[PDB]
From a paper:
Here we demonstrate that an invariant surface glycoprotein, [name], is a receptor for complement component 3 (C3). Within the VSG coat are found invariant proteins, including nutrient receptors, and a family of invariant surface glycoproteins (ISGs). C3b deposition occurs by a chemical reaction involving a reactive thioester within its thioester domain (TED). In this study, we show that [name], which is distributed over the entire trypanosome surface, is a complement C3b receptor.
We expressed [name] in E. coli and combined it with the ectodomain of [name] 1125G expressed in CHO cells. Crystals formed and the structure was solved to 2.6 Å using molecular replacement. Two copies of the complex were present in the asymmetric unit, with each receptor contacting three different [name] molecules within the crystal lattice, with surface areas of 814, 553, and 530 Å2 for interfaces 1, 2, and 3 respectively. [name] mutations at interfaces 2 and 3 had little effect on affinity for [name] when compared with wild-type [name], whilst both mutations at interface 1 had a large effect on binding to [name], with P1114R ablating binding. This allowed us to define interface 1 as the physiological interaction interface for [name] binding. While [name] residues 24–385 were included in the construct used for crystallisation, just ~60% of the chain was resolved in the electron density (residues 27–86, 94–154, 196–229, and 251–315). The ordered core of the [name] N-terminal domain consists primarily of a three-helical bundle, with helices 1, 2, and 4 lying approximately parallel to each other, creating an elongated architecture. At the other end, short helix 5 forms a hairpin with helix 4, placing the C-terminus along the helical bundle, opposite where [name] binds. The curvature of [name] produces a concave surface into which [name] binds. The location of the [name] binding site does not overlap with the thioester of [name], which allows [name] to bind to [name] that is covalently coupled on the trypanosome surface.
Author numbering:
A (entry chain A): 27 to 86, 94 to 154, 196 to 229, 251 to 316
B (entry chain B): 996 to 1285
């Protein structure tokens, strides 16, 4: 508590309620969602490698294929594993970063919410922030809530030590969201190859001729 | 309540599809009578006879299990993704009633994951069922990828504890199918798909936020998930939606929903009642349990 120039306004009390709420949703919910979803990407890429292997075991539907025909299917299967595996070193790095980044994001937001609560306490109600729930808990939402407080920020007032932890929450949440995207762009790049291999397995089990299985593999890429 | 359910005790008969149509009523009627405890009002001596008919339906169904662990109406017919998922759904609920082979059930679950789940999490039907009346609201086919993926994923979630140790790809399959449903939920137009995908997502704690708002808002008069068309589909959808409300532990919205389902006075029946009979009694027996 330090002396200031202006009285706190309704738009200043609401900005404080939103920053505490955003930090609470990041520390208790968002952080875990970004970690789980980033780490699942590497598991889907590995599943498509394991799954193509199981289809490769069936070349030993599949029994109707001639000796020359099985080599074509095997080649298509081996080239899909090449394209899927190519995306695994980026999706594994994303999931390894999202393990360390989650604990920094969860910690910084928890500290920013214990001092921000004491900044309200007579205490500010914060019931209108829960009603105006838009479910946007990104680093950009945390930033615009900080930007809105910085405009209505009275220079009687209180100190801003909570702001140092909140600034770290925004910085680390951007890093955590960047790891999610690095693994999202790897998962999506793996899809073309895994779709080609899925389309071949269906055409081979439906006993379609060789021209049909090759045409279906080409259309799924 | 039990005096009107005597017609549900059916002797199963027929090929791979007809066996599950005939099996369905007996299975869910035993399950409803155990939960609601109406065996004294129905006939106590009749429980053992009903279990033998369910075992009879189970054993006759194994004549249609293919070398691939998948099911079809006849052995020389291409396997059905819907039929296999439905068999998994009835056997998952009959584990407490009769002895179910775990390899039979978990082979079907593994076939669904390895053969029929697309890389994007969507379950694919490459050989539809001949009896289109046994699939219910799925028949319209409007949003096929969304509704069929909710159906198969509900069957996998019900078989999860049984097959977690035998099907290593089951956990990741469930989340991948739930990813697709969650991503395309807000764009659903049919009240039937809102209720079947709502329940599929509720089973894994992802029916929340805007998804939970759209689910509760598609309910006409806060009691039913009505689609302009078939009254059988509306009972089926409101049953899937009641199972999501109980899963959400939302015992505030539940009373007028159960009231509407009871007001329908639906007791199952023959032609076209496969999904409405299975789902109206699964949801009412679960409401009594919770």
């Amino acid at each position: 508590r330090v002396p200031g120039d202006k009285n706190l306004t309704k738009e200043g009390a609401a900005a404080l309620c939103k920053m505490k709420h955003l930090a609470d949703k990041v520390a208790e919910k968002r952080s875990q969602e970004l970690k789980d979803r980033t780490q699942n990407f590497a598991g889907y890429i590995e599943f498509e490698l394991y799954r193509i292997d199981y289809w490769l075991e069936k070349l030993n539907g599949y029994a109707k294929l001639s000796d020359s025909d099985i080599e074509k299917v095997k080649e298509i299967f081996d080239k899909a594993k090449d394209g899927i595996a190519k995306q695994l070193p980026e999706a594994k790095k994303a999931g390894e970063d999202a393990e360390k980044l989650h604990t920094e994001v969860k910690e910084a937001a928890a500290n920013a919410r214990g001092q921000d609560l004491d900044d309200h306490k007579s205490a500010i109600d914060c019931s209108s922030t829960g009603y105006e729930e838009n479910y946007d808990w990104s680093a950009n939402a945390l930033q615009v809530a900080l930007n809105s407080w910085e405009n209505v920020k009275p220079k009687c007032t209180m100190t801003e030590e909570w702001q140092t932890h909140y600034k770290e929450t925004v910085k680390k949440l951007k890093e955590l969201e960047g790891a999610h995207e690095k693994g999202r762009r790897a998962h999506d790049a793996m899809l073309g190859y895994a779709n080609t291999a899925y389309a071949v397995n269906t055409k081979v089990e439906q006993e379609k001729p060789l021209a049909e299985v090759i045409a279906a593999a080409k259309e799924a890429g | 309540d039990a005096e009107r359910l005597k017609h549900l005790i059916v002797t199963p008969s027929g090929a791979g599809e007809q066996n599950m149509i005939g099996m369905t009523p007996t299975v869910i009627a035993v399950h409803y009578l155990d939960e609601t405890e109406q065996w004294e009002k129905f006939g106590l001596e009749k429980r053992q006879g009903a279990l033998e008919l369910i075992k009879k339906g189970y054993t006759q169904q194994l004549a249609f299990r293919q070398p691939s662990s998948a099911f079809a109406a006849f052995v020389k017919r291409a396997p059905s993704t819907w039929l296999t998922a439905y068999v998994v759904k009835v056997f998952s609920l009959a584990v407490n009633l009769i002895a179910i082979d775990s390899q039979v059930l978990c082979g079907a679950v593994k076939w669904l994951i390895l053969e029929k789940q697309k890389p994007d999490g969507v379950f694919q039907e490459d050989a539809p069922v001949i009896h289109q009346e046994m699939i219910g609201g799925l028949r319209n086919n409007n949003e096929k990828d969304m509704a069929l993926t909710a159906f198969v994923l509900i069957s996998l979630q019900e078989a999860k504890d049984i097959c977690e140790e035998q099907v290593n790809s089951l956990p990741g399959s469930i989340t991948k199918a739930g990813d697709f449903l969650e991503a395309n939920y807000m764009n659903l137009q049919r009240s039937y798909t809102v209720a079947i995908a709502g329940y599929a997502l509720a089973q894994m704690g992802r029916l929340k936020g805007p998804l939970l708002n759209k689910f509760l808002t598609t309910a006409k008069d806060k009691n039913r998930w009505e689609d302009p068309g078939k009254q059988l589909y509306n009972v089926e959808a409101t049953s899937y939606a009641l199972l999501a409300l109980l899963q959400l532990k939302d015992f505030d919205f539940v009373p007028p929903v159960v009231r509407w389902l009871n007001e329908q006075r639906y007791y199952g029946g023959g032609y076209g009642s496969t999904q409405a009979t299975f789902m109206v009694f699964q949801a009412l027996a679960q409401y009594q349990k919770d």
